């Protein structure tokens, strides 16, 4: 379906030359190098057309990757394949560099040709790949591999044994927040995923509950149990899944079925663009004194439970560029200034909830605010916080091993709720 797929370094020579079509020419490849790899201009696109020829060439890192084709395809699946490729490269050997490619060359080649033959892309389920795809068959092994291929079950499921059956979850909630510098939450959204680290035997299908259509309602049920009309739980604004789920099962009854693999993985990522909890009440704003002085007023009211303790509190307060006369205000924490970035680093060792530290700033200037003027860099609060902002949490969690012995109770469960607010930026 596709031809050459060539990985490139910075110096531009191939790190691989992995062709899958006749049409592919050396005259083509070196041209691609000297023209994309080398170009006086520097604004480009991961996809490229040169003489009616597509070129999905990407630097997924310092290391590059060129996907050459002259066949109209879905670019999206091409990129999906590129991802899966580099991702499994990492999964099998972590870092991906010169030696990472070299000392894997043969596996690289056989995989690529398999996972994509003449451009026809095959699967990368790696249900048992790395076993025989290892950096010599038996009749049982022959039939075994043949069947596991024919077997419509992946993600490393053959029936495993773990001396215990336990899973540790970690709910990460990334605070996708923009608020008006005068105070109005322009962006109130959250990006979160269910990463699942599991240590269990066998191949269990598991289910799980997370409060739906209502704000939230073996050994520890919950320390923060879902009080009726509890923490923010909403129709998930967008719930994203992974190929263990059964969306047929969902859209039938709003519940997929997932046979999870073992070890760590991301069970389902999700987004909600509403119904969040604010950790502070900051009105960061700047004012200008004719044109000889820019003054910034930063009143950082922190707002959480004082029992909650955020640490290493570093708020980004850009100082005006031209600096003649400084005017500093201190309430609590540590006064730190940032030069070469022209910023008040109101760096505080730690903060409890429901607090307020105000810094008012004046910085004398020289007129440069013209038809082109000062860029107002959003004042941001950056710090540490674990948190269940929505607090949409485990409505239940159904795990088992309905084959031999170990039941629900024979599994010990966990979760973490790690908020993530580095997106706390506003000055303009």
């Amino acid at each position: 379906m596709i031809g050459g797929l060539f990985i490139y370094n910075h110096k531009g020579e191939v790190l691989i030359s992995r062709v899958y079509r006749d049409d592919i020419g050396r005259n083509a490849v070196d041209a691609f190098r000297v023209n994309v790899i080398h170009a006086r201009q520097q604004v480009r696109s991961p996809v490229t057309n040169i003489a009616r020829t597509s070129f999905f060439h990407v630097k997924r890192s310092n290391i590059w990757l060129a996907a050459v084709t002259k066949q109209n395809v879905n670019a999206a699946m091409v990129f999906e394949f590129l991802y899966k490729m580099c991702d499994v490269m990492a999964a099998y050997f972590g870092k991906i560099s010169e030696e990472n490619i070299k000392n894997n060359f043969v596996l690289i080649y056989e995989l690529l040709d398999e996972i994509l033959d003449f451009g026809y892309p095959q699967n990368s389920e790696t249900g048992a790949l790395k076993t025989f795809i290892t950096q010599h068959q038996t009749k049982e092994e022959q039939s075994q591999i043949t069947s596991q291929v024919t077997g419509q079950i992946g993600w490393r499921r053959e029936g495993i044994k773990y001396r215990r059956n336990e899973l540790f979850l970690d709910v990460l909630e990334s605070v996708n927040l923009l608020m008006s510098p005068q105070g109005q939450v322009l962006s109130a959204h959250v990006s979160g995923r269910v990463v699942m680290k599991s240590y269990l035997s066998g191949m269990p299908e598991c289910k799980f509950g997370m409060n739906d259509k209502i704000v939230i309602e073996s050994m520890e049920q919950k320390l923060i149990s879902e009080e009726d009309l509890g923490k923010q739980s909403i129709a998930i604004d967008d719930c994203t899944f992974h190929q263990c789920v059964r969306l047929s099962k969902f859209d039938s009854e709003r519940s997929i079925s997932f046979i999870p693999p073992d070890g760590e993985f991301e069970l389902m990522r999700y987004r909600t663009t509403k119904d969040i909890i604010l950790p502070f009440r900051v009105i960061p704003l700047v004012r200008e004194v004719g044109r000889t002085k820019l003054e910034v007023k930063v009143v950082i009211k922190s707002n959480f439970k004082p029992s909650l303790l955020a640490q290493k509190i570093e708020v980004r307060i850009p100082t005006p560029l031209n600096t003649s006369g400084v005017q500093v205000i201190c309430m609590k924490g540590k006064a730190k200034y940032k030069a070469s970035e022209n910023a008040i680093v109101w760096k505080i060792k730690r903060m409890a909830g429901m607090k307020e530290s105000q810094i008012s700033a004046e910085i004398e200037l020289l007129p440069t605010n013209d038809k082109k003027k000062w860029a107002r860099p959003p004042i941001s609060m950056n710090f540490e916080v674990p948190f269940a902002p929505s607090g949409l949490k485990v409505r239940y969690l159904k795990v088992f091993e309905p084959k031999l012995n170990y039941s629900d109770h024979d599994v010990i469960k966990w979760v973490r709720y790690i908020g993530r607010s580095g997106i706390y930026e506003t000055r303009c």
């Binding site: 999206a76 419509q152 082109k372």
Partner: protein, 579 residues
């Protein structure tokens, strides 16, 4: 596996020396130098004797590297392939089905005429096989066989066998069968793939539900070829699509939207599952732009496409297009662009505030785009047009031509929509002719001339000046001058005679375009004939175009629907336009 990356300077004879050691080590390292040569693109076909004599072996890795070298170099030397077919046979008698499939793919990676018959019945037994990999590779190498000579009764019987293998239980074999046949449809007797039927549709739908994303997308594009006979089966199909939400999405989602819009032409009153999807579609579309920059980039392409095709409920999700610093320049561009396309009459105040903010940023390109967009807003609701007046005026006063350059055309088109309103600026424009560098802006000024050469009285001297440009300017500029002068002579015959006569003589004798020359022909044989009649056609108003603002060719769009998901549509250039 470790790098070798060395071949030159008599070390080919050291490669021999180690090849003059049958022992495994020198053999393997020599092989790695061979792979080095093959990567750096230096032929080692000379080793085909060495390669074939050491090739008597049983090592899997050796088999694989020999597969690759042999294949890609017999590509450059079909002669010694005689050696290959023997081993390939030996492997087709190697009970390992995986090794057999590797033999099949290496073999079927080359097609001339001879290995063909060597594999044909063996190939049919790979079709009459029960291993997903053997039959799988069989289908893949049947496709590969269609590279050439794909017109033979033998390949046709293979086509019959695989065509029945379209009905297949094995997910792998049926999946690559679907992929293969979908690609074979590109072989254009234009009668490809007659296996479509309702029950087949249902079974492949079930498969899609249970088969990998590969087979799923293959099924999707095949459905993009099958034409249902009404909406009811299409109803059930969209029900099958209902669970086609979050997956290895991007490709699947684009192709699914393709197949849906292929059936999404009926009314949301005909079914509300229709409008249920319409409303439900926005948050996944956001995820598309909430994905990864490249896939969100593709998504932006597809979204502009959709807004073109479907101007609907997304009219309240402009939020996604809300530009930020960190946003990359072109992403910011399309953000703002569809922002304008998602005209929020409520936000237009703060929108334009932001717009002039952007104008006050530090890149020419997006600034020009925003000027054009603001002009379109002036072509949009009139209220805006006043702040447009003030802003674009002070932007003129920024005295950076390029902005003002395209702004000239912008205002030309605005005044085309809105004439004889703010002629006051034409005076200012009069000074601004000493910077004419854009045939667009120059043509806009000449258009102004043709417009108001009756009000423009100073037109005389400036026009006899502009007569400096008769050559070395693109024909449309000429034509614009000519029609402006025609308008003028119509409205002011008193002193255009000398002008029209000299310019006609010139443009008709210095002509190369017959349309230009015969246009001068028509110009005189209308104006010598009956200006008294010319004015009625010309000097009468010519109605407007009513808010195009970068419209789309429907049919092109309608046909790129067959590509929404594929390079053609996303690229917004015809699939034919690239081959």
């Amino acid at each position: 596996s470790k790098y070798f990356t060395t071949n030159k300077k008599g070390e080919i004879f050291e490669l021999k020396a180690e090849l003059n050691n049958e022992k495994k080590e020198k053999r393997k390292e020599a092989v790695k130098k061979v792979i080095a040569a093959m990567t750096v693109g230096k032929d080692v076909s000379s080793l085909f004797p060495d390669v074939v004599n050491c090739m008597q072996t049983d090592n899997l890795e050796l088999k694989k590297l020999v597969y690759l070298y042999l294949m890609n170099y017999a590509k450059s030397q079909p002669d010694m392939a005689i050696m290959a077919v023997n081993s390939f046979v030996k492997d087709c008698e190697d009970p390992n089905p995986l090794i057999r499939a590797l033999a099949v793919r290496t073999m079927g990676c080359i097609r001339v005429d001879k290995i063909t018959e060597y594999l044909c019945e063996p190939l049919r037994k790979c079709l009459k096989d029960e291993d997903p990999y053997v039959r799988k590779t069989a289908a893949v190498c049947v496709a590969k066989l269609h590279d050439i000579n794909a017109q033979m009764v033998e390949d046709q019987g293979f086509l019959d066998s695989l065509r029945d293998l379209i009905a297949d239980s094995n997910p792998m074999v049926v999946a690559n069968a679907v992929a293969a046949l979908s690609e074979i449809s590109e072989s254009h007797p234009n009668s490809n793939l007659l296996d479509l039927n309702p029950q087949n549709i249902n079974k492949l739908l079930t498969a899609l539900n249970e088969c990998t994303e590969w087979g799923q997308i293959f099924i999707l594009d095949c459905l993009s070829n099958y034409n249902p006979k009404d909406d009811r089966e299409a109803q059930s199909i969209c029900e099958r699509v209902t669970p086609r939400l979050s997956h290895a999405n991007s490709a699947v989602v684009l192709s699914a939207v393709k197949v849906l819009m292929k059936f999404l032409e009926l009314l949301p009153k005909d079914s509300d599952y229709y409008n249920m999807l319409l409303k439900k579609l926005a948050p996944p579309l956001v995820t598309l732009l909430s994905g990864e920059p490249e896939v969100q980039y593709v998504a932006l392409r597809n979204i502009n496409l959709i807004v073109q095709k479907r101007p609907e409920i997304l009219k309240q999700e402009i939020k996604v297009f809300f530009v930020k610093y960190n946003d990359p320049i072109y992403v910011k561009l399309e953000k703002l662009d569809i922002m304008i396309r998602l005209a929020s009459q409520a936000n237009i105040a703060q929108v334009l505030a932001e717009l002039k903010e952007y104008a006050t940023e530090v890149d020419v390109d997006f600034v020009r785009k925003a000027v054009r967009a603001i002009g379109r807003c002036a072509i949009k609701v009139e209220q805006s047009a006043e702040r447009c007046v003030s802003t674009l005026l002070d932007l003129i006063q920024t005295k950076v031509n390029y902005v003002v350059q395209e702004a000239i055309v912008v205002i030309r088109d605005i005044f085309r929509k809105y004439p004889n309103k703010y002629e006051s600026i034409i005076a200012t424009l009069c000074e601004n002719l000493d910077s004419l560098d854009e045939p667009d802006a120059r043509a806009a000024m000449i258009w102004i001339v043709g417009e108001y050469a009756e009000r423009i009285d100073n037109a005389d001297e400036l026009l006899e000046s502009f007569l400096e440009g008769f050559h070395d300017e693109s024909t449309q500029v000429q034509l614009t001058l000519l029609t402006a002068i025609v308008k003028l002579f119509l409205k002011k015959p008193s002193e255009t005679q000398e002008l029209v006569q000299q310019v006609l003589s010139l443009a008709t004798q210095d002509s190369d375009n017959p349309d230009l020359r015969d246009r001068g022909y028509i110009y005189w044989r209308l104006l010598s004939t009956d200006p008294v009649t010319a004015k009625e056609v010309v000097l009468s108003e010519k109605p407007l175009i009513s808010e195009e603002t970068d419209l789309i060719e429907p049919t092109l769009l309608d046909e790129l629907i067959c590509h929404i998901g594929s390079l053609a549509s996303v690229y917004h250039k015809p699939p034919n336009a690239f081959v």
